[PDB]
Coordinates of C-alpha atoms (C1' of nucleotides) in Angstrom, one line a residue:
Chain A
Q1 CA 22.2 6.7 228.6
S2 CA 21.1 3.8 226.6
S3 CA 24.6 2.3 226.2
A4 CA 24.6 -0.2 229.0
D5 CA 21.3 1.1 230.7
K6 CA 18.9 0.0 227.9
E7 CA 20.8 -2.4 225.7
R8 CA 23.0 -4.4 227.8
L9 CA 20.7 -4.3 231.0
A10 CA 17.4 -3.0 229.5
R11 CA 17.0 -5.5 226.7
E12 CA 19.7 -8.3 226.9
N13 CA 19.7 -8.6 230.7
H14 CA 16.0 -8.3 230.5
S15 CA 15.5 -10.6 227.6
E16 CA 17.4 -13.2 229.7
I17 CA 15.0 -12.8 232.8
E18 CA 11.7 -12.5 230.8
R19 CA 11.8 -15.0 228.1
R20 CA 12.1 -18.0 230.4
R21 CA 8.9 -16.8 231.9
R22 CA 7.1 -18.0 228.8
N23 CA 9.2 -21.1 228.5
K24 CA 8.4 -22.3 231.9
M25 CA 4.7 -22.1 231.6
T26 CA 4.8 -23.6 228.1
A27 CA 7.1 -26.3 230.0
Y28 CA 4.5 -26.6 232.8
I29 CA 1.7 -26.4 230.1
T30 CA 3.6 -29.2 228.1
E31 CA 4.5 -30.4 231.8
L32 CA 0.7 -30.3 232.7
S33 CA -0.8 -31.5 229.6
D34 CA 0.7 -34.9 229.9
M35 CA -0.7 -35.5 233.3
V36 CA -4.1 -34.6 232.0
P37 CA -5.1 -38.1 230.2
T38 CA -7.9 -36.6 228.4
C39 CA -5.7 -34.1 226.5
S40 CA -2.8 -36.1 225.1
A41 CA -5.0 -38.3 222.5
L42 CA -5.5 -35.3 220.0
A43 CA -4.5 -35.4 216.5
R44 CA -0.8 -34.4 216.6
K45 CA -1.5 -31.0 218.5
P46 CA -2.5 -31.0 222.0
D47 CA -3.5 -27.5 222.1
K48 CA -1.5 -25.5 224.5
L49 CA -4.8 -23.5 225.5
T50 CA -7.2 -26.2 226.1
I51 CA -4.4 -27.9 228.0
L52 CA -5.6 -25.7 230.8
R53 CA -9.3 -25.2 229.8
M54 CA -9.9 -29.0 230.1
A55 CA -7.3 -29.4 232.9
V56 CA -9.7 -27.6 235.2
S57 CA -11.7 -31.0 234.7
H58 CA -9.2 -33.0 236.9
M59 CA -8.7 -29.8 238.7
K60 CA -12.4 -30.0 239.2
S61 CA -13.1 -33.9 239.4
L62 CA -10.4 -34.5 242.0
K63 CA -8.6 -27.3 252.3
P64 CA -6.1 -28.3 255.0
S65 CA -3.6 -30.0 252.9
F66 CA -3.7 -30.9 249.2
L67 CA -2.7 -34.6 250.2
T68 CA -5.1 -37.0 252.1
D69 CA -4.4 -38.5 255.6
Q70 CA -4.3 -42.0 253.7
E71 CA -1.8 -40.6 251.4
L72 CA 0.3 -39.0 254.2
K73 CA -0.3 -42.3 256.2
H74 CA 0.7 -44.4 253.3
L75 CA 3.5 -41.7 252.5
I76 CA 5.0 -41.9 255.9
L77 CA 4.5 -45.6 256.0
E78 CA 6.5 -45.5 252.8
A79 CA 9.0 -42.9 254.0
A80 CA 10.4 -44.9 257.0
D81 CA 7.5 -47.5 257.8
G82 CA 6.1 -45.4 260.5
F83 CA 2.8 -46.3 262.3
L84 CA 1.2 -44.0 264.8
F85 CA 0.3 -45.5 268.3
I86 CA -1.2 -43.4 271.2
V87 CA -1.1 -45.0 274.5
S88 CA -2.3 -43.6 278.0
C89 CA -0.1 -41.7 280.6
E90 CA 0.6 -44.7 282.8
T91 CA -2.4 -47.0 282.1
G92 CA -0.5 -48.6 279.3
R93 CA -3.6 -49.2 277.2
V94 CA -3.3 -48.1 273.5
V95 CA -6.0 -45.6 272.6
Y96 CA -5.3 -45.5 268.7
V97 CA -4.6 -48.2 266.4
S98 CA -2.7 -47.5 263.2
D99 CA -3.9 -48.8 260.0
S100 CA -0.2 -49.3 258.5
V101 CA 0.6 -51.5 261.4
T102 CA 2.9 -53.5 259.2
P103 CA 6.3 -53.8 260.9
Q104 CA 0.0 -58.2 263.3
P105 CA -3.5 -57.3 263.5
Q106 CA -5.4 -55.8 266.3
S107 CA -5.6 -58.9 268.3
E108 CA -2.6 -57.8 270.5
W109 CA -3.1 -54.2 270.2
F110 CA -6.9 -54.1 271.0
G111 CA -6.6 -55.7 274.6
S112 CA -3.3 -55.9 275.5
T113 CA -1.2 -52.8 276.2
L114 CA 1.9 -51.6 274.7
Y115 CA 4.0 -53.3 277.3
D116 CA 2.5 -56.6 275.9
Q117 CA 3.8 -56.1 272.3
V118 CA 7.2 -55.1 273.7
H119 CA 10.2 -57.3 275.2
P120 CA 10.2 -57.4 279.0
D121 CA 13.5 -56.2 279.0
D122 CA 12.1 -52.9 278.6
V123 CA 11.3 -53.0 282.2
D124 CA 12.8 -49.4 282.6
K125 CA 13.3 -48.2 279.0
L126 CA 9.5 -48.3 278.6
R127 CA 8.2 -46.6 281.9
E128 CA 10.6 -43.7 282.4
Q129 CA 10.1 -42.3 279.2
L130 CA 6.4 -42.2 280.1
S131 CA 4.7 -39.7 282.6
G132 CA 10.9 -32.5 277.9
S133 CA 7.6 -32.1 276.0
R134 CA 8.7 -34.7 273.6
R135 CA 10.2 -38.2 274.6
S136 CA 13.1 -39.9 272.5
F137 CA 13.8 -43.5 273.3
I138 CA 14.2 -46.8 271.4
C139 CA 12.1 -49.4 273.0
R140 CA 12.2 -53.2 272.2
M141 CA 8.7 -54.2 270.5
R142 CA 8.4 -57.6 269.1
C143 CA 5.2 -57.7 267.5
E144 CA 12.7 -64.5 264.7
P145 CA 9.8 -61.8 265.6
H146 CA 12.1 -60.4 268.5
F147 CA 14.7 -58.3 266.6
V148 CA 12.5 -55.4 265.2
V149 CA 14.0 -52.3 267.2
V150 CA 11.6 -49.5 266.9
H151 CA 13.0 -46.0 267.8
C152 CA 10.1 -43.9 269.0
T153 CA 9.8 -40.3 269.7
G154 CA 6.7 -38.1 270.3
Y155 CA 4.9 -35.8 272.6
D156 CA 4.6 -20.5 267.4
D157 CA 3.2 -19.2 270.6
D158 CA 0.1 -21.6 271.4
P159 CA -0.7 -22.7 275.1
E160 CA -3.0 -25.8 274.5
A161 CA -4.6 -27.6 271.4
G162 CA -8.3 -27.7 271.0
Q163 CA -8.8 -31.3 270.2
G164 CA -10.1 -34.7 271.9
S165 CA -8.7 -35.6 275.1
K166 CA -5.0 -36.6 274.7
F167 CA -3.0 -36.4 277.8
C168 CA -0.4 -39.2 276.8
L169 CA 2.5 -39.8 274.2
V170 CA 1.6 -39.7 270.4
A171 CA 4.9 -40.8 268.7
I172 CA 5.8 -43.0 265.6
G173 CA 8.0 -46.2 264.9
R174 CA 10.6 -46.9 262.4
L175 CA 13.1 -49.7 262.1
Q176 CA 16.4 -48.1 263.2
Chain B
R1 CA -9.9 -10.7 224.2
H2 CA -8.8 -14.2 224.2
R3 CA -5.9 -13.1 226.2
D4 CA -8.0 -12.4 228.9
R5 CA -9.9 -15.8 228.8
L6 CA -7.1 -17.6 230.7
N7 CA -7.5 -15.7 233.9
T8 CA -11.0 -17.0 234.0
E9 CA -9.2 -20.3 234.0
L10 CA -6.4 -19.5 236.3
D11 CA -8.8 -18.0 239.1
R12 CA -10.6 -21.6 238.9
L13 CA -7.4 -23.6 239.4
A14 CA -6.4 -21.2 242.0
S15 CA -9.7 -21.6 243.9
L16 CA -9.5 -25.2 242.9
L17 CA -6.3 -25.6 244.9
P18 CA -6.1 -27.3 248.3
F19 CA -4.8 -24.5 250.5
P20 CA -6.5 -22.1 253.0
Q21 CA -8.4 -19.0 251.8
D22 CA -6.3 -16.7 254.0
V23 CA -3.4 -16.7 251.7
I24 CA -4.9 -18.8 248.7
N25 CA -4.4 -16.0 246.3
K26 CA -1.0 -15.1 247.1
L27 CA 0.0 -17.5 244.3
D28 CA 1.6 -15.9 241.3
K29 CA 0.6 -16.8 237.9
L30 CA 3.7 -19.4 237.6
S31 CA 3.0 -20.4 241.3
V32 CA -0.2 -21.9 240.3
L33 CA 0.8 -23.7 237.3
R34 CA 3.6 -24.8 239.4
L35 CA 1.3 -26.2 242.3
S36 CA -1.1 -27.1 239.6
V37 CA 1.4 -30.0 238.5
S38 CA 2.7 -30.5 241.8
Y39 CA -0.7 -31.8 242.8
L40 CA -2.1 -33.8 239.9
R41 CA 0.9 -36.0 240.1
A42 CA -0.2 -36.6 243.8
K43 CA -3.4 -38.0 242.4
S44 CA -1.1 -40.6 240.9
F45 CA 0.9 -40.8 244.0
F46 CA 0.0 -44.5 244.1
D47 CA -2.7 -45.5 242.0
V48 CA -5.0 -43.5 239.8
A49 CA -4.8 -46.3 236.9
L50 CA -6.4 -49.7 236.7
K51 CA -4.8 -51.5 233.9
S52 CA -3.5 -54.7 235.6
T53 CA -6.1 -57.4 235.4
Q54 CA -9.3 -38.2 258.6
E55 CA -7.2 -37.0 261.4
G56 CA -3.8 -38.9 261.0
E57 CA -1.7 -35.7 261.0
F58 CA -0.2 -36.3 264.5
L59 CA 2.9 -37.9 263.2
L60 CA 3.9 -34.7 261.2
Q61 CA 4.2 -32.9 264.5
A62 CA 5.7 -35.6 266.2
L63 CA 8.5 -35.6 263.6
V64 CA 8.3 -36.4 255.6
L65 CA 10.3 -35.0 252.7
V66 CA 9.6 -36.1 249.2
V67 CA 12.1 -35.8 246.3
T68 CA 12.3 -36.9 242.6
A69 CA 14.9 -37.9 240.1
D70 CA 15.0 -34.7 238.0
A71 CA 16.5 -32.7 240.9
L72 CA 13.1 -31.1 242.2
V73 CA 10.7 -31.8 245.0
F74 CA 7.4 -33.6 244.8
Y75 CA 6.0 -32.9 248.4
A76 CA 7.0 -31.0 251.3
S77 CA 6.0 -32.0 254.8
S78 CA 2.6 -30.3 255.9
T79 CA 4.6 -29.5 258.9
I80 CA 7.9 -28.3 257.3
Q81 CA 6.8 -24.7 257.7
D82 CA 7.2 -24.7 261.5
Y83 CA 10.5 -26.6 261.9
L84 CA 11.6 -24.6 259.2
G85 CA 11.2 -20.8 258.4
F86 CA 9.5 -21.2 255.2
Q87 CA 6.2 -22.4 253.5
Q88 CA 5.4 -25.5 251.8
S89 CA 4.1 -23.8 248.6
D90 CA 7.1 -21.5 248.2
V91 CA 9.4 -24.6 247.5
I92 CA 7.0 -27.3 247.1
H93 CA 7.9 -27.9 243.3
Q94 CA 11.4 -25.9 242.8
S95 CA 14.7 -27.6 242.7
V96 CA 16.1 -28.9 245.9
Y97 CA 19.6 -27.0 245.4
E98 CA 17.6 -23.8 245.8
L99 CA 17.6 -24.6 249.7
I100 CA 20.7 -26.8 250.1
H101 CA 24.4 -25.6 250.4
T102 CA 26.8 -25.2 247.6
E103 CA 29.6 -27.8 248.0
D104 CA 26.9 -30.1 249.4
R105 CA 24.9 -30.2 246.2
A106 CA 27.3 -33.0 244.9
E107 CA 26.0 -35.2 247.9
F108 CA 22.4 -35.4 247.1
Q109 CA 23.3 -36.0 243.4
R110 CA 25.1 -39.1 244.2
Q111 CA 22.5 -40.7 246.4
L112 CA 20.6 -41.6 243.3
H113 CA 22.8 -42.3 240.4
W114 CA 25.4 -44.3 242.3
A115 CA 23.0 -45.7 244.6
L116 CA 20.4 -47.1 242.0
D117 CA 14.7 -53.8 244.8
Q118 CA 14.4 -53.4 248.4
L119 CA 18.2 -53.8 249.0
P120 CA 21.4 -52.1 249.6
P121 CA 20.8 -49.3 250.0
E122 CA 17.1 -49.0 250.0
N123 CA 17.1 -46.9 253.3
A124 CA 20.1 -44.5 253.4
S125 CA 20.8 -42.0 256.3
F126 CA 23.4 -39.1 256.1
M127 CA 23.8 -35.6 257.1
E128 CA 24.2 -32.5 254.8
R129 CA 23.9 -28.7 254.7
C130 CA 20.4 -27.5 254.6
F131 CA 19.1 -23.8 254.4
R132 CA 17.4 -21.9 257.2
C133 CA 14.8 -19.1 257.2
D134 CA 15.8 -14.4 261.0
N135 CA 16.8 -15.8 264.5
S136 CA 18.9 -18.2 262.6
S137 CA 22.5 -18.9 261.3
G138 CA 21.1 -19.8 257.6
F139 CA 21.8 -23.6 257.5
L140 CA 21.0 -26.6 259.4
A141 CA 22.4 -30.0 259.0
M142 CA 19.4 -32.3 259.1
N143 CA 19.6 -36.1 259.1
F144 CA 17.9 -37.2 255.9
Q145 CA 17.3 -40.9 255.9
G146 CA 15.4 -41.8 252.7
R147 CA 13.8 -45.1 251.7
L148 CA 14.1 -45.4 247.8
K149 CA 10.7 -46.3 246.1
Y150 CA 9.4 -46.6 242.5
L151 CA 6.7 -43.9 242.4
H152 CA 4.2 -44.0 239.5
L153 CA 8.9 -42.8 229.6
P154 CA 8.9 -45.8 232.3
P155 CA 9.1 -45.0 236.0
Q156 CA 12.2 -43.7 237.8
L157 CA 13.7 -43.7 241.2
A158 CA 11.8 -41.7 243.8
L159 CA 12.6 -41.0 247.4
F160 CA 10.5 -41.2 250.5
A161 CA 12.5 -39.9 253.4
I162 CA 12.0 -37.9 256.5
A163 CA 14.6 -35.3 257.6
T164 CA 15.0 -34.3 261.4
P165 CA 17.6 -32.0 263.1
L166 CA 21.1 -32.7 264.3
Chain C
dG1 C1' -15.3 -6.6 214.3
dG2 C1' -13.2 -11.1 212.7
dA3 C1' -8.5 -15.4 215.9
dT4 C1' -2.9 -18.7 217.1
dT5 C1' 2.1 -18.6 220.2
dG6 C1' 5.2 -15.2 221.1
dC7 C1' 8.2 -10.8 221.3
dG8 C1' 9.4 -6.6 223.3
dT9 C1' 8.9 -2.2 227.6
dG10 C1' 6.9 0.0 231.0
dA11 C1' 3.0 1.0 235.4
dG12 C1' 3.7 -0.4 239.9
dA13 C1' 3.8 -3.5 243.3
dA14 C1' 6.8 -5.3 246.7
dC15 C1' 10.7 -6.9 248.4
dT16 C1' 15.1 -3.6 248.4
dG17 C1' 18.7 -0.2 253.0
Chain D
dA1 C1' 16.3 8.8 246.5
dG2 C1' 16.4 2.9 246.3
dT3 C1' 15.6 -2.4 244.0
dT4 C1' 14.0 -6.6 241.9
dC5 C1' 9.5 -9.0 240.4
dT6 C1' 4.6 -9.5 238.8
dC7 C1' 1.3 -7.8 235.6
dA8 C1' -0.4 -5.2 232.1
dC9 C1' -1.8 -4.1 227.0
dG10 C1' 0.9 -4.0 222.3
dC11 C1' 3.3 -5.7 218.5
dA12 C1' 5.2 -9.3 214.2
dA13 C1' 4.6 -14.0 213.7
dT14 C1' 1.6 -18.7 212.2

DNA sequence: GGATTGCGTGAGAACTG
DNA sequence: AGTTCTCACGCAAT
């Protein structure tokens, strides 16, 4: 009964599936001790236990998402250089001014509308896409400065969205 | 008794983890240590050193997929749990092939070694076979267009990309 | 009554039909 | 019946 039921799949097969459990944590422990700068400078032995006891320090020093908006913002801005812009339904006046608008300060986005920051050739490709719950279109925004084609696209069982007054388009922009 | 002095530390880091309380403690012992390492590196996403002498989450729904050089993930979109049938913490740190097709694993491997400093090809774009949650067919061919970076044993090549459907 | 990483197996949840 | 796992106290090693 212990031929292949306890020796080949009871110990061997298990030993292969329960030994790595102790090598991955030590790996992570060694993989986590390095990140902690206050644990590597120890007399030839970062203690594999204090690697976590003091690790709570940085775990303490540093709810929605473990990353911060400025991170994701800089993250997406680093992803494909995407800035967030929120204009009105038809008014054309931009509501939000994105802090990663490095495709050009708020001089043109504060008063002038989006139509002012694009090329007039968008006479139709910039109004039809305005008011499919989500719009996909590649308008011609300018700010040499006229060739930064920006491809924009924006908008379980949930009806509305408890948030500020946002009946308009909120999309991104990436050099495509 | 020292073999129990750890859980007193784990319940801390588990509670010291940026995730909702609804399913916070659903993390296994290796899940916390896995997520415990996938967050501190975020601390140094950009700058946690100094040697050299909000509500902005509207873009995630209007769509961010991070990748490393050792064939594992660094950060999964905070909205990659609705367009895809899984959660962020479940694979926020595990290898990418665990969610990529078989014959297609060689494609992602070549986008880093044979590719690589803002020059050809700093920003790549291609299709591939991705996994699916089931009301699904088990794979989706997203369009991964990444922008290579130098995220900070010297630094290695990172990947700041955003994948979308086909 | 005393402590270090690390090696087994089994009580039992929890994903298996 | 079924299964993989996570989690548990116990053991020979420093």
